[PDB]
Design a protein around this ligand. Structure first.
Ligand SMILES: C[C@@](CCn1ccc(-c2ccc(-n3nccn3)cc2)cc1=O)(C(=O)NO)S(C)(=O)=O
Ligand SMILES: C[C@@](CCn1ccc(-c2ccc(-n3nccn3)cc2)cc1=O)(C(=O)NO)S(C)(=O)=O
Ligand SMILES: [Cl-]
Ligand SMILES: [Zn+2]
Ligand SMILES: [Zn+2]
Length: 300
């Protein structure tokens, strides 16, 4: 059959705290009709404020990706969006009782598991993909983010931390999703930050919810998490996870390749804005036969 749009098969509920705000938050994911996209809804507000998870609604990009509308925000959307992108969810309502998505364990793992426990539902409309037709590159300072045409979906990233826990380690990684599992090899990679910064971050209402329970906390010369890392390259794999979530603000799955060098949320969003504006560089495609497409998805 054709590759169909997907939504949730059942309502998902989760509770947690915002990484940056520390606020308790209830998250509810609900099915949504064809061509809705992913839409966040601040249900603590009346009337609610609904913000489509789209590049045009990105306000702040300092320490997380934040959506804004009116006076209102939804902070830290990237890890949830990474899970929804990795599982191929097109349409969903994401209700939140506070201004920040819960951080869970710092990775996309818990969201992936909650979604896959609920199940996905195919819908009676073709899934639309954005295919990169021409290279699009943005740079600022020593940072670079690029889309290049590629028959599939592939994400590469390089970091360069002047820090003794990072020097001599694997700071580059490349994942081609024709051969590597998002679920197994990317989704579990946790966010990370530095003990040196915590008093300063908190003085700015950042990382107020952060701890070893939801982040890899790096001290001056060692990782503080007593149970260790999930991947030897967990840091760069988390940057790949972040990039997948930020890229999903295009609103559709990508057929193309992303390469990041010290990119973060701000440059990722600048890349999306430049791609969207360079309409010669992309097109929207659908697949009447899943067998012949360059990307394939797990059973729903
Ligand atoms: C079969 C296999 C891999 C399956 N697959 C397929 C697609 C994606 C994927 C993830 C993100 C995006 N995207 N983000 C932003 C925009 N678009 C697009 C596609 C992830 C994945 O995992 C598997 O087993 N998965 O468990 S495989 C044999 O390659 O291991
Ligand atoms: C932007 C980014 C990272 C986001 N982040 C994550 C964790 C912390 C953090 C820092 C210190 C502690 N802590 N100190 C003592 C005890 N606990 C706990 C958590 C700070 C932060 O800013 C990201 O993942 N965005 O999605 S990242 C990897 O791209 O730089
Ligand atoms: Cl950046
Ligand atoms: Zn992150
Ligand atoms: Zn052009």
């Amino acid at each position: 059959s054709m590759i169909k749009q997907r939504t949730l098969k059942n309502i998902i509920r989760a509770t947690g705290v915002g990484l940056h705000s520390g606020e308790k938050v209830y998250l509810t994911l609900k099915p949504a009709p064809v061509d809705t996209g992913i839409v966040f809804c601040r249900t603590d507000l009346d009337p609610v404020v609904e913000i489509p998870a789209r590049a045009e609604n990105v306000g702040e990009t300092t320490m997380s990706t934040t959506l804004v509308k009116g006076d209102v925000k939804v902070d830290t959307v990237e890890h949830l969006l990474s899970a929804m992108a990795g599982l191929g969810i097109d349409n969903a309502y994401v209700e939140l009782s506070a201004s920040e998505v819960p951080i869970m364990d710092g990775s996309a793992g818990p969201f992936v598991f909650l979604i896959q426990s609920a199940g996905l539902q195919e819908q009676e409309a073709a899934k639309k993909f954005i295919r990169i037709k021409r290279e699009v590159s943005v740079e600022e300072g020593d940072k670079r983010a690029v889309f290049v045409p590629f028959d599939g979906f592939k994400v590469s990233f390089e970091i360069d931390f002047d820090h003794p826990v990072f020097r001599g380690r694997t700071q580059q990684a490349s994942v081609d999703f024709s051969s590597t599992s998002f679920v197994k090899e990317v989704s579990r990679a946790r966010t990370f930050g530095f003990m040196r910064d915590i008093e300063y971050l908190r003085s700015q209402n950042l990382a107020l919810g952060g701890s070893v329970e939801n982040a890899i906390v790096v001290d001056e010369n060692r990782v503080l998490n007593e149970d260790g890392l999930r991947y030897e390259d967990e840091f760069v794999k988390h940057k790949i996870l972040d990039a997948i979530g930020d890229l999903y603000l295009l609103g559709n799955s990508l057929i193309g390749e992303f390469r990041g060098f010290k990119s973060g949320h701000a440059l990722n969003n600048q890349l999306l804005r430049t791609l969207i504006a360079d309409k010669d560089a992309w097109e929207v495609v659908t697949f009447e036969d899943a067998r012949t497409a360059p990307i394939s998805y797990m059973r729903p």
